[PDB]
A paper describes a structure:
Zearalenone (ZEN) is a mycoestrogenic polyketide produced by Fusarium graminearum and other phytopathogenic members of the genus Fusarium. Furthermore, we report site-directed mutagenesis as well as structural analysis of the dimeric ZenARe of R. erythropolis and the more thermostable, tetrameric ZenAScfl of Streptomyces coelicoflavus with and without bound ligands. The X-ray crystal structures not only revealed canonical features of α/β hydrolases with a cap domain including a Ser-His-Asp catalytic triad but also unusual features including an uncommon oxyanion hole motif and a peripheral, short antiparallel β-sheet involved in tetramer interactions.
For ZenAScfl, the calculated molar mass of the 6xHis-tagged monomer is 34.667 g/mol (again assuming cleavage of the N-terminal fMet), and the observed molar mass of 138 kDa indicated the presence of a tetramer. Two inter subunit interactions are responsible for tetramer formation. The other interaction, between chains A and D (B and C), involves the peripheral antiparallel β-sheet (the “flake”) and is mediated by 12 residues over an interface area of 234 Å2 with ΔG = +1.9 kcal mol–1, with a P-value of 0.805 (chains A/D ΔG = −5.8 kcal mol–1, KD = 54 μM at 25 °C, according to Prodigy, light pink).
Author numbering:
A (entry chain D): 10 to 308
B (entry chain B): 5 to 308
C (entry chain A): 3 to 307
D (entry chain C): 9 to 307
Amino acid sequence: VHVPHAYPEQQVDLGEITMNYAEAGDPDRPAVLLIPEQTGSWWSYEEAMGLLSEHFHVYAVDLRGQGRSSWTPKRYSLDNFGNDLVRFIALVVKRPVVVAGNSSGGVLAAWLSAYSMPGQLRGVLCEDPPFFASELVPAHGHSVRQGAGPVFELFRTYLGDQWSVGDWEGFCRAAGASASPMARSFVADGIPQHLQEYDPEWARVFYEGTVGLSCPHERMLGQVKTPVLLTHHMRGIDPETGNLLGALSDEQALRARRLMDSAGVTVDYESVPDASHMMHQSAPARYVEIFTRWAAALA
Amino acid sequence: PALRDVHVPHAYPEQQVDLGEITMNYAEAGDPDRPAVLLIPEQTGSWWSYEEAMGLLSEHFHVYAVDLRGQGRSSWTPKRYSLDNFGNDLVRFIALVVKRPVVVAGNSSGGVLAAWLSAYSMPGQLRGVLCEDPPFFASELVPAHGHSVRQGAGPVFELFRTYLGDQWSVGDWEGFCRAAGASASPMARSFVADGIPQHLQEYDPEWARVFYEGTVGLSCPHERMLGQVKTPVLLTHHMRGIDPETGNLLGALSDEQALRARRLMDSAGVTVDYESVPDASHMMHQSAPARYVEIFTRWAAALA
Amino acid sequence: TSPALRDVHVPHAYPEQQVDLGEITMNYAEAGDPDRPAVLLIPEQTGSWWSYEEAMGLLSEHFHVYAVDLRGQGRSSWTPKRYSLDNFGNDLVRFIALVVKRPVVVAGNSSGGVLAAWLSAYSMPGQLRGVLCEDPPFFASELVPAHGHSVRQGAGPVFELFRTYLGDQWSVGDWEGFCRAAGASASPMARSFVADGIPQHLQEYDPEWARVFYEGTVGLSCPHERMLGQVKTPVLLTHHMRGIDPETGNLLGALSDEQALRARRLMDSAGVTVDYESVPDASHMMHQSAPARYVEIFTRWAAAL
Amino acid sequence: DVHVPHAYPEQQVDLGEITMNYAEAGDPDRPAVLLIPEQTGSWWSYEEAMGLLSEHFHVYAVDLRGQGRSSWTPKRYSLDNFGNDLVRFIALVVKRPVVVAGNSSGGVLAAWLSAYSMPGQLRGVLCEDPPFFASELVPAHGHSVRQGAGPVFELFRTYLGDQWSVGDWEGFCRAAGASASPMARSFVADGIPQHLQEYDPEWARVFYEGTVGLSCPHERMLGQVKTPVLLTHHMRGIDPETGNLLGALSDEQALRARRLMDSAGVTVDYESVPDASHMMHQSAPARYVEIFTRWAAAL
């Protein structure tokens, strides 16, 4: 299923799983780790990796259940993703890292900041993170069922765990009829390449609230141990449904920022209301600029 | 309280009816020829929660006020507390005792059960329902609109579950008061008292468990309940607000949740009458009985 | 003509009618002289009222027989998000109060046999003379039973296949995918359902049924321990084929010998008369595979009542 | 607040989210061994055995999170989190291949490490009377936890409570003496045992509610082991009055565990000691140490 890409691909044995990834930049430059969004593979960062390879040693990784990394039925949880990335940092990077993650990847960047092995990290970028919005029963704001829940429901029903169903036509019919604008956005004639590399059990665990069941966001956010850059992209409310448009509300962002303040770290909050969910794709230069500014200030 | 030897006297005499699984305790007032009314109390509330309002309404109505299962002298039923079990209990009560079409008034939890009846009773049993400060969507763990119970009254339910326990099996009122006095929830700070209130002595705290854990209405989502109401609905909306410190709701339901609930009930095609009294306490039938009875009597007069 | 469209019902030997119970419409068939003792037949899961067709005939010569489609089945209402033991049971309570209007002898198969017991414990007073539980999955249909194997070691495999490949209200409807998955399954029951076309009874079936059993929500507020321990009418429990799949250890049949033992002990503690008829040579749906045997068993029992 | 003197000095190490307390015996000349206690069991559960083992092994006995002097972590008690804790401990303290040995819940974590640790971390594992499948809420084979140890877990959750928030030992004893579960009755005592004073009862909650193993089904674990295994099966039977399990796991559950582990391609040794207590390393130290040493020398 796997198509050619700009950078050569490598695979590492993290124990339970094998992780696919891709390197860029001069080795001696500072290390950067790029975590894709859900339904996103490492080559989600390609453009940005280019821009970033000028100054950093860039690693971009396929999480488990994505890309060419291992698919693990019944094993998708926040802690398993996070310890995957911890083992990657220790076995492959072998140096302190600045982590950047988009959406679910941003959630795992915060997870690393709070729960990585000591001194594994210098700072994390959380790019449009669904703090509390990706939870089934958050401590603040809307649940996943009022956010991206609908999209996940469609993935679970019509694609199935490990593409066991694979009813793409049914998926497009129901998605086009969804009141969720994001749901109606995922419609296409053929299956996008990124979804072909995606295990839809990801959707199941987010929709059903099991992925973070033992990793509540308030404790994560209250236990961060590194500087955090939080970018906050398009956001809004669908008047017809009340549902959250975007990754997280202003209220949820404020609560997350104040929890991270209680953890005693320094937070750079950059509201970019006009940016798309995946700014590293829609506007690679703007994203690399923000990241580089914040990164220079560390250590 | 766990021995259930706490019954005390009241203004009206008390009757009991076998409904099948449970026995329901209840009180009755007014001329039996008058239009029938069914009063459903709030959680932790017994029938006598309506005593005062029964004394006014009785002058114009045949009033029945009930103890739901797990409250008062009605049966306590471990592992059996769901919205459908409460509702079908009330259906059987209407069929076996009232034997007339009723107008139903419910407060908080009862108001939700009132809407339940409006949607799910046997045909013809109801002429209309009053939902008094109902936690529409705010009592669900995963509501379709707005904020979950965990961001509302879930803190107090958690205290009840941990420190009082199913059927008062723990009964650590000292630990409960200690934790309640230190809660960010003001509603929890309300319950702190030197002695256990009579209404809490008659209350089975497994109630609190099933609401806090999301099991009580798991098979009865509020979106569909409200989208299938079948009688005129009178929804009163009392004090609501936001604790600036927590972002957790104060009061029964948020403005957004009231809005979406009204939209659902209108899609059901019923006449919805929204009466907003932001200065009113949660149990207006107890704190301002005259005002409550006036509102109810005016709306009920227009029913038929 | 699609199971999702609910336009697949076919003619049958007995007249059908629908009653408004308030949330749902319940479809039902009637047979026999309306003055003879009343009887209520509850089908099995994926079973419609005409699951009893043949038995109805034999029984209608001595009983006024009602046979019902439960919600989520046949021509009764399909109610998304509303499928639970208590809702099924209260539908049947309503049906007895509104249609039969006389005390009834209830007989239910499998899931229906679990609802017969439900009624015996939780119905309105005086509604029932006795109940016949035909191969009921006591404890084996629960996700976390007090005794014996869970539904995941019983019928769960086939329920998972229904949920995944048919979907709520036939929203997925991938019959060929279901057949491929079922034929490769290690559950013999699951393999049984493979067929060239979709069987008629399954066309009338809301597979959300399967979901609520597979996920353990259908009986969450109705633990079988409490139900069985609060029966208030005489109960006849028939126990058909049962065994253990050696490759898996999973239950073959409706319930295990141990689970039937514990259920009988519970019911005996309730103070009711309990009859136990172990018929190890009988299929799960004895009322279909051996109608005359079934009617003999039922007739003796009901005449004692 | 309650820790008392023991036969060995205690050490602590920061694993990144938690602080793990532990004790050490024997010499670095000798091969590394990692002892994992049972639930409610602290490191000193192994004290006597440690002595014997220190004759020929460098021994590490650990406090798991929520036990002893290790960090208490509310809402974070999952098998994956315990397991990644022990992976971190092996990586940061032992820094050597280790022969792991765990008892009861500890045996389950030993299996977890065999299947899911970082590559090359382990040489083999001894699962001592492990509750394979019988500690799960919905096991793929045999009794569930609710027909096993679940009754005592429910008593712990209702009367001791999260982080000893309730602490009603009188009520615990009243309920335990009236328990139909004989193990529940075995926990009745005048005062609170020292091992239970260092124990966080949220442990009991997450086993009773089935959250701890939700994302770690035992069938996948056992089918993906990667080291030689030694499984010891102690006392087991059935309570006639309830049908409930006596012991860690049934004969059927042991049979299925072994079939899975053998399907994984490892060397599985099965040692049935039907007359042994649950904590044989405590009740018969020399017997336990003989069995362990006899097996570990083959590695």
